[PDB]
Design a binder for this molecule. Structure first.
Ligand SMILES: Nc1ncnc2c1ncn2[C@@H]1O[C@H](COP(=O)(O)OP(=O)(O)OP(=O)(O)O)[C@@H](O)[C@H]1O
Ligand SMILES: [Mg+2]
Lengths: 469, 47, 517, 122, 50
């Protein structure tokens, strides 16, 4: 009757012919069954182009191996819809909304289309607001933006998963919010590891995981971020909850878009990215924002091709990023957690008109001292601390103290140690680092600064080693 | 004087490495774009 | 001794058992054919990736389907295809015979032997595109897969179920690394324990046939063909064989992984497999992209490399470890296929030509090489003796500019310089000479404990060789209980120090001096 | 044609052939002069998509079998001195010994202009 | 080709000729223009295959 039939199969690209008055809308999801017993499945096809003569060109989300010309294609009448609600917490999904750890779960939930518009112009916030996380280094040197975007530049063995757990904890406890993780181009080994680590830290109940993996066609890797963002938008708008979205290698979203553009026969652009690189990046990043009092904040891992920051993909991604947190192995080796590089990380709202005058002055003094210590570190390494000047040695001591006080006892560490995590206010952090820059703690041993909170914890840790204010 | 001159030469070599790397990344991007232009030109000539 | 009537009665029972009853079959016709591609009108019921039978016993794969014809890739003997020939359906997608009969054989990317040693009896058949283990069907990578190379096992450890890309220019030692890894499983196979045995699959894509013969000879000289299968798509094979060879080698060794066995697979120069897929895709007129690649070449390699997994205990606990090989040009790891495979894998061993020419062999850049599994793929002894190795080597690399200014350096800095020189000499290793893990532990203990600070840099290799010889001959208890207990307790370390001191007072340096502290 | 003569001398006469091929690259280059006229979409650097396949079906006949020797020596043109060019880069994998000549060594007046650090032998 | 034919007629009568092709690059570019105008598929730098 009103169902279509497959006409062409060229890899992941499938052309489908419908009756004259039954052509599906663009982005609609169509279903076609592969009946070969070894490869029997149900392909979902997203309408990509209207070719004319009742033909539509669609991108398949599953491998099309075993698909026959002429088979029935059913139009669902809607785009890809994911389950939304509180029930998605603690469960793993793919870009199609299928539960991975429990198949068939969430089929009776409300379903939301993943293609949505950003908030209207009159609903946007004209005022930038800082997100008070509770970590000293973040709140001081690279303050986050509420409803903003934070690039994350940490690899393996620098505590990136610990930082993700920490932010999940802090959004769930200090804001009453929820977390959505998007694994875009996720490795299945690392996805299983993330699942197990979140279940063992008891933060999975606060997080909804959406995995579009590497062994999948480009359409799923291109739509997984929209699926996770749709869940986050339901949590923000319908539940009234601050959300934290985690995008795995946002670059892989760009790369899957480029691959889909190549498969659809579109002429490439500069370097090669799809001609609509900026448009797709904007359509995604504009839905992450504050509206009606609630917000979605996003920590996104960014891959930079060839370390070239002028490459079109990082250049288009950085047009939407508000802060940068680079996790360093040199900081991780010194035992400082989180291993945030204070000199390499940054924020666009570390500005006297956003954070204030004293915040800015204290942060800039800290950065100056740390940069001078970085300059002296090589003279110390090759020659020795004994060769330095007197003011040089004094600054070295003060800078080691500031380095170690930038560390913190994180809430992701309560699973191992057993002692809770700190939430230091901005005022206390500003005052503590002002005093540290003056020199009020140059007699305290270094170890008294490792993994503590504010100034009370500093005093009680100092007097445990035999040192007063 | 030798210490000061070697610090100056180190800063100059740093700035030269930075400028040369910028030029090399420009040439890399340009090479990829030109190769894609030739491939797509042939493919469009045959289509 | 010829089995004469064996042959006679064999073909006789075949010809008596030949009853090919005639049934219907849906057929098509070749309309055009060129460069390894054939288009076939008809066949309305053919599915994507279905095998087709062209006259003369020729095989094809239906890749492009449209309203006019089926574009198929010919798998061999393409010069026999003609316009007008009748093409038949097989009703099956590409599958391969699997089983333990493939150990010690060289096969096609179709399961057909090319070594001329007879037929291969197969357990069953396995489709080439069976999906990968789910995200919930897996397990953390926890068991080490010892390569026998000290640089890899100490710096970039590989675990059972992990994917460690081997990437380098050319003639940098990638095949040598992978063949040494294969040869290192000889003792595991000799143990007879299915928990320790590793079956190996070597996939040769687009290689000269005599190079495959040389690899097979190297594996036979070391007793490694008792547990190794070679899937060879030589350089003279079609682009379809070069495209299918890693999927054939991975379909085999998935039959083993799903039986609770542990497998290691090597895809030698996946770059050539990507080039073959690009040739097929350009001949099928699919839209090209960067470097003319089809646009699903990342999918081509990630679909293959995500089937290497560590299965959960409910699925048997088997594992498949992938060692894909990528050749770069002018050390350009930002090329398209290198970027893709670096993105896909769990770690990379970068091999440099300059390091090779300086004498650093294996020519691994330990600074940029990385394993994301890390210390979870090491035994505790190796995890303990190699923890102070990476920082030491980085300090040595930072201080290499001050080689001729030791008197102008801090005493600690000159100590770091000498220690780093010793450690760089310690990570060198001959070709086709993998070391068991207990001996690598003893060697890295020699290095990082300080027992080489008194040996000349140009004598470290000989000192380590002769000390390991001594311990293999005299003090077998240290190695034996390191291997059994997987750790180096304090009494073992004490006995090791004693043996090292006695050997030092026995050892004779090349400069005539004494290595005694 | 020359390969067929050498193959006859190897497989039928059976005695120690020497095969010299001056610029086997030209073979490849010829295949790229007719590629687009044959209706083939171009590959990366303007070469035919069947570069490695034709090079393999030709280079695998230039070989010694068991007991039948052919010592082969080919000149390989490196276009624009670029050793990363697809044609020499895929020729590299078909060889037991490669002598690589550099224009940097040529300009210094050293002859034969062999690059000692880029050349190899199995 | 015109100059080379004029010269070859002399060469084939026992005479010695010297021909100078000033900027064969312009001749290659004119051939590229002709080939692109006949809509023959381009190669590198849009030059024809021949
Ligand atoms: N650890 C080593 N010590 C000494 N020599 C080595 C070592 N590894 C490799 N070689 C030598 O280097 C040469 C080239 O190595 P190999 O063939 O393994 O490199 P490759 O990566 O396979 O390069 P290609 O694929 O281009 O041949 C070999 O002849 C081998 O003898
Ligand atoms: Mg090799």
């Amino acid at each position: 009757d009103t169902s279509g039939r497959v006409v062409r199969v060229t890899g992941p690209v499938v052309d489908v012919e419908f009756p004259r008055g039954s052509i599906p809308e663009l982005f609609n999801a169509l279903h076609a069954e592969i009946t070969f017993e070894s490869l029997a499945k149900t392909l979902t096809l997203e309408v990509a182009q209207h070719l004319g003569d009742n033909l539509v060109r669609t991108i398949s989300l599953q491998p099309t191996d075993g698909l026959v010309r002429g088979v029935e294609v059913i139009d669902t009448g809607r785009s890809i819809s994911v389950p939304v609600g509180e029930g998605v917490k603690g469960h793993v999904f793919n870009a199609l909304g299928d539960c991975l750890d429990e198949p068939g779960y969430g089929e009776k939930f409300e379903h939301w289309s993943i293609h949505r518009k950003p908030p209207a112009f009159e609903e946007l916030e004209p005022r930038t607001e800082m997100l008070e996380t509770g970590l000293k280094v973040v709140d001081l040197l690279t303050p986050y933006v509420r409803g903003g975007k934070i690039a994350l530049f940490g690899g393996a063995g620098v505590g990136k998963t610990v930082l993700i757990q920490e932010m999940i904890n802090r959004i769930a406890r200090n804001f009453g919010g929820t977390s959505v993780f998007a694994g875009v181009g996720e490795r299945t080994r690392e996805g299983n590891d993330l699942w197990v680590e979140l279940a063992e830290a008891n933060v999975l109940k606060d997080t909804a995981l959406v995995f579009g993996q590497m062994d999948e066609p480009p359409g799923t890797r291109m739509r997984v971020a929209l699926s996770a963002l749709t869940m986050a938008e339901w949590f923000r708008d319908e539940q009234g909850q601050d959300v934290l979205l985690f995008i795995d290698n946002i670059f892989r979203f760009t790369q899957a878009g480029s691959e889909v553009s190549t498969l659809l026969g579109r002429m490439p652009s500069a370097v090669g990215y799809q001609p609509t690189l900026a448009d797709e990046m904007g359509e995604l990043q504009e839905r992450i924002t504050s509206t009606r009092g609630r917000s979605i904040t996003s920590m996104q891992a960014v891959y930079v091709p060839a370390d070239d920051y002028t490459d079109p993909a990082p250049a288009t991604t950085f047009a939407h990023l508000d802060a940068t947190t680079e996790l360093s192995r040199a900081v991780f080796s010194k035992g400082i957690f989180p291993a945030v590089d204070p000199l390499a990380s940054s924020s666009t709202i570390l500005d006297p008109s956003v954070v204030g005058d004293e915040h800015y002055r204290v942060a800039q003094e800290v950065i100056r001292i740390l940069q001078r210590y970085k300059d002296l570190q090589d003279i110390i390494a090759i020659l020795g601390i004994d060769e330095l000047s007197e003011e040089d040695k004094q600054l070295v001591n003060r800078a080691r103290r500031i380095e170690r006080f930038l560390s913190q006892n994180m809430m992701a560490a309560e699973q191992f140690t057993g002692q809770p995590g700190s939430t230091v206010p901005v005022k206390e952090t500003i005052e503590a680092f002002d005093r540290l820059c003056k020199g009020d703690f140059d007699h305290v041993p270094e170890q008294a600064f490792f993994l503590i909170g504010g100034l009370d914890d500093l005093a009680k840790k100092a007097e445990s080693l035999g040192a007063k204010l | 004087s030798r210490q000061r001159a070697m610090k100056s030469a180190t800063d100059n070599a740093d700035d030269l490495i930075k400028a040369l790397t910028l030029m090399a990344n420009r040439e890399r991007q340009a090479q990829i774009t030109q190769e894609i232009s030739e491939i797509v030109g042939g493919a469009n000539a045959l289509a | 001794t010829i089995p004469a009537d064996d042959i006679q009665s064999a073909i006789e029972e075949y010809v008596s058992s030949f009853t090919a009853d005639t049934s219907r079959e849906e057929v098509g016709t070749v309309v055009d054919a060129g460069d390894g591609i054939a288009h076939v009108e008809g066949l309305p019921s053919v599915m994507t990736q279905e095998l087709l039978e062209f006259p003369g016993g020729i095989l094809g794969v239906a890749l492009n389907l449209d309203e006019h014809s089926v574009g198929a890739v010919i798998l061999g003997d393409f010069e026999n295809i003609e316009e007008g020939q009748q093409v038949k359906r097989t009703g099956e997608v590409l599958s391969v015979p699997v089983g333990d009969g493939f150990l010690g054989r060289v096969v096609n990317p179709l399961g057909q032997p090319i070594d001329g040693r007879g037929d291969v009896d197969s357990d069953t058949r396995r489709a080439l595109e069976l999906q990968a283990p789910s995200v919930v069907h897996r397990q953390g990578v926890k068991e080490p897969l010892q390569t026998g190379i000290k640089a890899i096992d100490a710096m970039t450890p590989i675990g059972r179920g992990q994917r460690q890309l081997i990437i380098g220019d050319r003639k940098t030692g990638k095949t040598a690394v992978c063949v040494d890894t294969i040869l290192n499983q000889r003792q595991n196979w000799e143990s007879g324990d299915p928990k320790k045995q590793v079956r190996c699959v070597y996939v040769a894509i687009g290689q000269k046939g005599t190079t495959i013969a040389a690899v097979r000879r190297t594996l036979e000289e070391g007793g490694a063909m008792d547990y190794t299968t070679i899937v060879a798509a030589a350089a003279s094979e079609s682009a379809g064989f070069k495209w299918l060879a890693p999927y054939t080698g991975s379909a085999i060794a998935q039959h083993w992984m799903y039986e609770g066995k542990h497998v290691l697979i090597i895809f030698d120069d996946l770059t050539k497999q990507a080039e073959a897929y690009r040739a097929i895709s350009l001949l099928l007129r699919r839209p090209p992209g960067r470097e003319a690649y089809p646009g699903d070449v990342f999918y081509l390699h990630s679909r293959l490399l995500e089937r290497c997994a560590k299965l959960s205990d409910d699925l048997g606990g088997g594992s498949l470890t992938g060692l894909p090989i990528i050749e770069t040009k002018a050390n350009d790891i930002s090329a398209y296929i290198p970027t893709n495979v670096i993105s896909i894998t769990d770690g990379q061993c970068f091999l440099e030509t300059d390091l090779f020419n300086q004498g650093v062999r294996p020519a691994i850049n330990v600074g940029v090489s990385v394993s994301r599994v890390g210390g979870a793929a090491q035994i505790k002894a190796m995890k303990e003796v190699a923890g102070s190795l990476r920082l030491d080597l980085s300090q040595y690399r930072e201080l290499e500019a001050f080689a001729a200014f030791a008197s102008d350096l801090d005493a600690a800095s000159k100590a770091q310089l000498e220690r780093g020189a010793r450690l760089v000499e310690l990570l060198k290793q001959p070709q086709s000479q993998p070391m068991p893990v207990e001996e690598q532990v003893v060697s890295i203990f020699l290095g990082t404990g300080g027992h080489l600070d008194s040996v000349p840099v140009e004598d470290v290799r000989r000192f380590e060789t002769e000390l390991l010889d001594h311990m293999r001959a005299s003090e077998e208890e240290i190695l034996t209980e390191i291997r059994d207990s997987q750790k180096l307790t304090e009494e073992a370390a004490d006995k090791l120090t004693e043996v090292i001191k006695n050997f030092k007072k026995g050892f004779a340096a090349t400069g005539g001096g004494s290595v005694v502290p």
